[PDB]
Ligand SMILES: O[C@H]1CO[C@H]2OCC[C@H]21
């Protein structure tokens with residue numbers, strides 16, 4: 751199917767600015783993140799693809815799994831955190847939409863060196 755780079759864009763990119771309270775419910779579904787199960791948590795970045803791709807040349811930091819290919823953005827970015835509620839039960843996945851402005855940390859790989867995993871937001 752899709753590549754790791756493409757999967758990252760599908761799961762985490764939404765350049766279309768600060769996200770409603772129904773945002774995650776619609777987005778998690780439209781991006782096919784509720785196909786096999788209700789993905790517990792997810793984060794969407796409201797910045798241009800170029801700006802997110804540029805993070806691969808920014809601050810090198812350790813990944814949560816111990817690998818060394820993670821990078822933290824020098825500036826904060828507009829992001830939306832999606833967290834599954836308790837009343838949420840597949841195939842009816844319910845999410846809590848939370849907007850914020852924080853630095854993002856992504857793992858990069860390949861040639862071209864691009865984001866392939868969203869590690870965290872700090
Ligand atoms: O869960 C509530 C929050 O905002 C409403 O609009 C659509 C669905 C909704």
Ligand SMILES: O[C@H]1CO[C@H]2OCC[C@H]21
Nearest residue numbers: 835836837838839840842
């Ligand atoms: O499993 C139970 C716990 O809370 C309910 O609401 C939706 C599904 C439910």
